Design a protein around this nucleic acid. Structure first.
Lengths: 50, 117, 88, 112, 251, 183, 88
RNA sequence: GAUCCUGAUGUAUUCGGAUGGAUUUGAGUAGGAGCGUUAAGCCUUGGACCCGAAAGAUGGUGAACUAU
RNA sequence: AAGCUCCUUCGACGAGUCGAGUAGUUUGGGAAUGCUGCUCAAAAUGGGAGGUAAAUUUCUUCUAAAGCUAAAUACCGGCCA
RNA sequence: UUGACCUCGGAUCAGGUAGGAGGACCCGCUGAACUUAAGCAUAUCAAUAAGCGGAGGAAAAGAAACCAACAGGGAUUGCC
């Protein structure tokens, strides 16, 4: 029986971020209206201001 | 190549003749203790391990149990009559077994054993 | 101490992107900054870099937010220019 | 020992469909050159020519990939605003640009 | 959906990057570089040499991986890479040498961590039947599926496999874009540089009948044994010469 | 058979029975002194295989030792430190060998088997008259116990080239310049 | 190499060092029953009873450090489960 | 010996270098010279032809402050 | 009391120790060269170390976590010569 | 009420034992710097000197979880 390559619940990467940004600091994007880019190539807006 | 202190670690062998005389007198003293007996124990003939030296034989540590049995010398009596015994060495070859049994038989033929007390 | 502009040092790709590099000894397209929104964002950057460390967290947040808003308004200004020149 | 029939049987077992009429380049992103690089590398020991041929093969692959990928409409260029983790660390490239600095300075210092 | 893939057609490929016990620091650096370039992968530590090559397959089933990239080091000196599709076939063994890993400060190139690469292959890879099986597996290993949620959105590097000698040479390059003169692509080496020579292709996960044998593989252990035999040969020649000299002196 | 039953029960340490017993004892030993005498070995099978007998001349001492490091790491173990402290306390006895008993989170605990060399039974019995011999004074101080041998690397093989037969002796032998009469 | 007549050697008890002592096995099983289970073994037992067998095996690796040790621990605990089931 | 070729019977169907060559290279072959030691000279390292700089470190002995 | 021989009988071998992760230190020696601390923590046709591309991880060689032991070796101190 | 067992104490109870000196060589812990070289830094000096603990006439090590790939060797130690 052949392997089905899924990511089960215990997998470290079961839940992955949508930011598609690695382990870099968030010191970047600090002067920019957005935070990171999604996998489809679209930049991600900051939600709002508090 | 003198970055270290060879002066505080240097050795001179001016006692070479003195140590030689000491060793010769030590061999004389063990001959005085073991008077009729030789001052060495019988050693087997073995083959050198490395392929560099595998065509020459030398003297091993002691005789193996099965070759001792084949020659007919009891294990508990061999170190008594002056034959070294090595329980770690194994024959693995009829050639070595036969050569060592020949050596032990030559010792048997040349040996003089005194009847206890 | 010598300048990396004087030395023929190639640009290296780090977390900050190199982007489309421009060839050496050639005409690099001069981009003219003339929109009041663009001077707004440049001036906001200059004022932030001059003022520097503000103790208050909300003050830091507000200067950063005005920088982001200047960048945004510049973005819709450029998008509107693009649409105007693409349909009309 | 080279069993072509068995090798092809094993290929047919695993061969994911890459036919261009049905499978997009955005899906495979693999392109094969139309020229053997061993025919452009006369001597294997010639490091400069060997690396040049490898680079040329990769350049052809990159240009064809860009053409197909732009036709299919997926982003190719990395925006100057996109900061992300890189395979080689920032300290590593600081060291690399440093060594480039000492090399250039040594050369122009010898000239001076 | 647990595939972590957002795409119209799902290419579910999961890679298990495994190390053996006797690997060196350079081998571990190569493994780390490959794992960093592979986002659909899982790094896994030393594997028991007394264990089973199909216990590799159960381990991959444990981690739900359909491809295995296994590093097996011999004498702490030589690398061997087993590429496999687990569970049913096929699997190749390469002798890995000539390693130049990353963090070697002479490459000058970089790429995003996990971005989809461009796979460059060779006309020999399409001509020879076994090179065709090795191309497919290397595609399945370095595929970096289209909709995977750990991959980067932009493309900036090309991984090129070339066949010049009876070996496979792998290079990794950054695509730098330069504005044309009144854009053009330039390539700068970014990553690992190692040479693979094929040894066997087995039908079956880590076993089964042999489908291809190099029959021209010169083992580094064969070179070492040749050196040892040469030393012994000179020693024995000297002994024979001494015997002949003594014999002629007698005569 | 009780000795193998105890050996297996000691092998299974995080088992419920052993964990409960170790907790209560760890409490009892914290209430007791840093170094104190034992009566009977809490691990009789370990003591017996290390060489403890129920003769007039064998004693046990339990010692508490603080755990951790000096980022510097002490080359001697906490086991060797316990043996040395027990010897300094009972200077009239020879430290035969020590074994682990409890660990908590602040201190490790060790029972040290010691032998009286001046006792008549010990002197008359062989197998221990060697420790009656004077060359074995403060084996724990000279590193001649099992912990000392382990720390000194007194093993045979290509992995122990620099430490077997004495590390300092090997260094001296390698760093002496030997000059003969005929050079 | 050289041609020597091979000899067959007697069985080595040091080679028989591998433990086949049925009495040692009996002692080990009885001690397992008497002492019980460690907390991590209890977690593995819970996972194996619930059916998370691949998770159990991964946790056994994380707690022990080797694939073979994890496999042996999982087999031992599965045998304990089977013996408990047939005993109840 | 090495490099670039030229390409023979054939061979396991993929294994090899024979002939003729080259503005090539050897610390090459081309009918062995080395080993040991004495004396003198030179080079390097050790204190290094002799005398002489401030410093740093390890371990000890003592006191000096309307500061109380 | 002891040695051998034979067998339709048996044959027990060292655990907070291996080992995994990690920090320091050390070595010619990240198959971590050894050692120490710290978190986890084993096995019984077992375990350790090597050999090997040869097709699977075959083969080779030893039994760790208990202990004793003269000699060949060192010696600027002790009794002397 | 009595008497055992276990644990912990007292005695100028009977009998012993440790300290300190020495430390040339020996076994451990701890541990520098001067110097040399190198764009810089690791390194070298040195796993040395100083400091601390512990033995003897020798000490230590020592009877393979060794070496090896052999046609095998066979505790440890020292010289070439």
């Amino acid at each position: 029986d052949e392997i089905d390559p899924v990511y089960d619940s215990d997998d470290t990467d079961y839940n992955v971020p949508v930011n598609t940004i690695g382990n870099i600091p968030l010191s970047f994007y600090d002067s920019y209206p957005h935070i990171g880019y999604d996998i489809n190539g679209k930049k991600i807006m900051r939600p709002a201001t508090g | 190549h003198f970055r270290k202190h060879w002066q505080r670690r240097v050795r001179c062998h001016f006692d070479q003749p003195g140590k030689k005389v000491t060793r010769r007198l030590a061999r004389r003293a063990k001959a005085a203790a073991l008077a009729p007996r030789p001052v060495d124990k019988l050693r087997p003939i073995v083959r050198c391990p490395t392929v560099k030296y595998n065509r020459r034989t030398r003297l091993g540590r002691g005789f193996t149990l099965e070759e001792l049995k084949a020659a007919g010398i009891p294990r508990l009596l061999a170190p008594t009559i002056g034959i070294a015994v090595d329980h770690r060495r194994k024959n693995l070859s009829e050639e070595s077994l036969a050569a060592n049994v020949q050596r032990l038989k030559d010792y048997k033929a040349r040996l003089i054993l005194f009847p206890r007390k | 101490v010598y300048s990396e502009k004087e030395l023929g040092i190639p640009q290296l790709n780090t977390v900050t992107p190199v982007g489309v590099t421009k060839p050496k000894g050639k005409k690099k397209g001069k981009v003219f900054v003339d929109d009041r929104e663009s001077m707004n964002t440049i001036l906001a950057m200059v004022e932030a870099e001059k003022q520097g460390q503000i103790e208050s967290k909300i003050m830091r947040a507000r200067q950063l937010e005005e920088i982001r808003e200047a960048r945004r308004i510049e973005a819709e200004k450029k998008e509107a220019e693009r649409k105007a020149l693409l349909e009309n | 020992i080279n069993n072509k029939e068995g090798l092809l049987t094993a290929l047919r077992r695993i061969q994911l469909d890459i036919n261009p009429k049905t499978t997009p380049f955005s899906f495979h992103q693999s392109v094969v050159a139309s020229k053997r690089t061993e025919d452009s590398i006369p001597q294997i020991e010639d490091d400069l020519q060997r690396e040049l041929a490898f680079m040329n093969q990769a350049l052809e692959a990159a240009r064809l990939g860009r053409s197909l990928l732009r036709k299919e409409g997926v982003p190719f260029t990395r925006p100057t605003d996109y900061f992300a983790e890189m395979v080689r660390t920032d300290a590593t490239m600081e060291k690399v640009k440093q060594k480039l600095i000492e090399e250039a300075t040594a050369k122009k210092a010898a000239a001076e | 959906d647990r595939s972590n893939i957002i795409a119209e057609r799902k290419n579910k490929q999961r890679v298990l990057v495994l190390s053996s016990r006797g690997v060196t620091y350079r081998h571990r650096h190569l493994l780390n570089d490959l794992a960093s370039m592979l986002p659909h992968g899982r790094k896994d530590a030393k594997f028991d040499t007394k264990s089973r090559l199909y216990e590799l397959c159960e381990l991959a089933e444990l981690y739900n991986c359909n491809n295995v990239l296994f590093f097996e080091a011999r004498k702490g000196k030589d690398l061997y890479m087993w590429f496999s599709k687990v569970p049913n076939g096929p699997t190749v063994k390469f002798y890995a040498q000539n390693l130049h890993t990353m963090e070697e400060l002479h490459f000058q190139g970089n790429c995003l961590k996990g971005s989809r690469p461009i796979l460059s292959f060779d006309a020999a890879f399409e001509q020879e039947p076994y090179l065709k099986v090795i191309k497919e597996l290397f595609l399945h290993t370095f595929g970096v599926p289209q909709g995977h949620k750990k991959s980067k959105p932009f493309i900036d590097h090309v991984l090129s496999f070339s066949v010049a000698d009876g070996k496979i040479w792998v290079r990794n390059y950054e695509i730098r874009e330069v504005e044309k003169v009144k854009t053009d692509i330039n390539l700068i080496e970014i990553g690992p540089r190692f040479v693979l020579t094929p040894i066997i292709i087995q039908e079956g996960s880590f076993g089964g009948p042999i489908l291809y044998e190099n029959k021209r593989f010169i083992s580094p252990n064969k070179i070492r044994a040749e050196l040892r035999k040469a030393k012994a040969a000179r020693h024995h020649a000297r002994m024979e010469q001494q015997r002949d000299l003594l014999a002629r002196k007698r005569q | 058979g009780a000795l193998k039953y105890l050996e297996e029960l000691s092998k299974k340490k995080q088992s419920d029975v052993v964990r409960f017993l170790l907790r209560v004892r760890c409490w009892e030993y914290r209430q007791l002194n840093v170094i104190h005498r034992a009566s009977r070995p809490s691990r009789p099978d370990k003591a017996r295989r290390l060489g403890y007998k129920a003769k007039q001349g064998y004693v046990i001492y339990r010692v508490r030792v603080r755990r951790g490091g000096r980022q510097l790491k002490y080359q001697r173990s906490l086991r060797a430190t316990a043996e040395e402290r027990v010897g300094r306390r009972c200077s009239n006895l020879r430290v035969l060998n020590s074994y682990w008993v409890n660990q908590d989170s602040t201190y490790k605990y060790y029972e040290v088997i010691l032998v009286d060399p001046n006792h008549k039974a010990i002197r008359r019995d062989p197998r221990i008259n060697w420790i009656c011999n004077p060359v074995h004074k403060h084996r724990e101080c000279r590193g001649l116990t099992s912990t000392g041998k382990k720390s000194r690397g007194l093993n045979k093989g290509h992995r122990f080239n620099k430490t077997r037969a004495g590390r300092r002796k090997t260094w001296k032998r390698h760093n002496t310049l030997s000059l003969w009469r005929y050079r | 190499g050289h041609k020597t007549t091979r000899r067959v050697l007697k069985e080595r008890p040091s080679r028989r060092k591998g433990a086949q002592s049925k009495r040692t096995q009996f002692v080990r099983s009885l001690i397992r029953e008497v002492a019980g289970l460690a907390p991590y073994e209890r977690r593995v037992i819970e996972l194996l009873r619930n059916g998370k067998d691949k998770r159990a095996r991964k946790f056994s690796k994380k707690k022990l450090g080797t694939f073979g040790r994890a496999k042996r621990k999982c087999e031992e605990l599965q045998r304990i489960i089977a013996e408990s089931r047939r005993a109840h």
